[PDB]
Scaffold this active site. Structure first.
Site, short mmCIF file in Angstrom:
data_model
loop_
_atom_site.label_atom_id
_atom_site.label_comp_id
_atom_site.label_asym_id
_atom_site.label_seq_id
_atom_site.Cartn_x
_atom_site.Cartn_y
_atom_site.Cartn_z
N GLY A 124 0.78 -1.24 0.00
CA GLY A 124 0.00 0.00 0.00
C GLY A 124 0.81 1.28 0.00
O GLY A 124 2.00 1.28 -0.35
N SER A 150 0.03 9.38 2.47
CA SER A 150 0.45 10.74 2.08
C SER A 150 1.98 10.88 1.88
O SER A 150 2.43 11.36 0.84
CB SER A 150 -0.11 11.81 3.05
OG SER A 150 0.67 11.92 4.23
N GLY A 190 4.20 8.60 1.12
CA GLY A 190 4.73 7.75 0.05
C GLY A 190 4.30 6.30 0.23
O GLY A 190 3.13 6.02 0.54
N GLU A 191 5.25 5.39 0.08
CA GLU A 191 4.91 3.98 -0.07
C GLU A 191 5.13 3.07 1.15
O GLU A 191 5.98 3.36 2.01
CB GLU A 191 5.62 3.41 -1.30
CG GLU A 191 5.12 3.99 -2.60
CD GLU A 191 6.14 3.87 -3.72
OE1 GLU A 191 7.33 3.63 -3.41
OE2 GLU A 191 5.75 4.03 -4.91
N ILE A 192 4.34 1.99 1.20
CA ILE A 192 4.42 0.97 2.26
C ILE A 192 4.73 -0.41 1.66
O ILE A 192 4.05 -0.87 0.73
CB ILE A 192 3.12 0.90 3.11
CG1 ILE A 192 2.73 2.28 3.65
CG2 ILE A 192 3.29 -0.07 4.28
CD1 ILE A 192 1.70 2.24 4.78
N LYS A 251 8.10 1.74 5.56
CA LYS A 251 7.56 2.96 4.96
C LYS A 251 8.73 3.77 4.38
O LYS A 251 9.76 3.97 5.05
CB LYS A 251 6.72 3.76 5.97
CG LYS A 251 5.89 2.86 6.94
CD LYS A 251 4.72 3.54 7.67
CE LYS A 251 3.72 2.42 8.26
NZ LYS A 251 2.57 2.79 9.27
N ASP A 295 -5.34 14.30 13.30
CA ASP A 295 -6.01 13.70 12.09
C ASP A 295 -6.75 12.42 12.46
O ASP A 295 -6.42 11.34 11.98
CB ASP A 295 -4.97 13.43 10.99
CG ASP A 295 -5.58 13.30 9.57
OD1 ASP A 295 -6.75 13.65 9.24
OD2 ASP A 295 -4.80 12.87 8.75
#
Length: 294
Positions: A15, A18, A20-22, A37, A127
């Site tokens: 996945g 916000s 970037g990538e996991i 991450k 958030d």
């Protein structure tokens, strides 16, 4: 093949977010799976390093995942942490986008605890949304975790408890659907805003939607203003109509809080705990998705 530090290997792209990538990584000595991450060092709002520090501050709290490693490697900030299960938004989808009152009250008890904990370490989360709560894995499947401290901010001195000062002409910074009214108004967030957002999260689960979703506009900034207006125009009575009175009292209490007040988390938890008992539910940890998968 690809390794982070000289200790984890990178794999399946499970996945993004916000930052970037996991990726799904594995510790090399132990073969334990972890979450990796990656954030481009160029991004406009870097958050991974800041998070590594907040997660150190929060370490050991119930439902706070552990960080295993942080560092800059080549062009990325890299944050390696515990792997967790599906987010509440994922599970809400699995559950046909409406959750039973019993499920909502078992959640509320944990989520209020997670918020009180973050606030006890002098931070606001800022958030609060269903995507930022994840269920644990295996044996911790019944525990709700809180993640994503990318927007977090210190609201008081950790030594003196001197609260940050009041301020009014801020840019809007949450996720519009769950942001507090004061947030739409450009007012400095404090503890009460985290709690009001959590109230919206709970009503989204219980009602299946909030009345300011699906508003039509020309551009985001216009849609955002329509969202603030609809929030202001929806009374607590109207939001909570046909649901237990405990949810209206939750919002009344939030609305009663001054900028720097310390919330009475016990009082809010007690509302939902007494309702749970009065309904006759058993506190087992059988959420809608738990019964559904079996």
């Amino acid at each position: 093949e690809p390794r982070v530090g000289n200790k984890f290997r990178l794999g399946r792209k499970i996945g993004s977010g916000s930052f970037g990538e996991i990726y799904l990584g594995t510790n090399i000595q132990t073969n334990e799976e972890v979450a990796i991450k990656l954030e481009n060092v160029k991004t406009k709002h870097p958050q991974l390093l800041y998070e590594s520090k907040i997660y150190r501050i929060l370490q050991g709290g119930t439902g706070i995942p552990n960080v295993r490693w942080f560092g800059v490697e080549g062009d990325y900030n890299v944050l390696v942490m515990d792997l967790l299960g599906p987010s509440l938004e994922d599970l809400f989808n699995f559950c046909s986008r409406k959750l039973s009152l019993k499920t909502v009250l078992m959640l509320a008890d944990q989520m209020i605890n997670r918020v009180e904990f973050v606030h006890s370490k002098s931070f606001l989360h800022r958030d609060i949304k269903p995507d930022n709560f994840l269920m644990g894995l295996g044996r911790r499947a019944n525990q709700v975790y809180i993640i994503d401290f990318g927007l977090a901010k210190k609201y008081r001195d950790t030594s003196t408890h001197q609260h940050i000062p009041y301020r009014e002409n801020k840019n809007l910074t949450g996720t519009a659907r769950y942001a507090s009214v004061n947030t739409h108004l450009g007012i400095e967030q404090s503890r009460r805003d985290d709690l009001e957002s959590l109230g919206y999260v709970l009503m989204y689960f219980l009602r299946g939607s909030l009345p300011w979703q699906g508003l039509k506009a020309g551009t985001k900034k216009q849609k955002y203003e329509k969202i603030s207006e609809k929030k202001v125009a929806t009374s607590i009575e109207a939001l909570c109509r046909g649901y237990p009175t405990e949810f209206a009292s939750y919002f009344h209490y939030c609305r009663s809080l001054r900028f720097d007040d310390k919330p009475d988390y016990s009082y809010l938890k007690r509302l939902f705990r007494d309702l749970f008992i009065r309904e006759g539910f058993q506190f087992d940890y059988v959420f809608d998705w738990t019964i559904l998968k079996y």
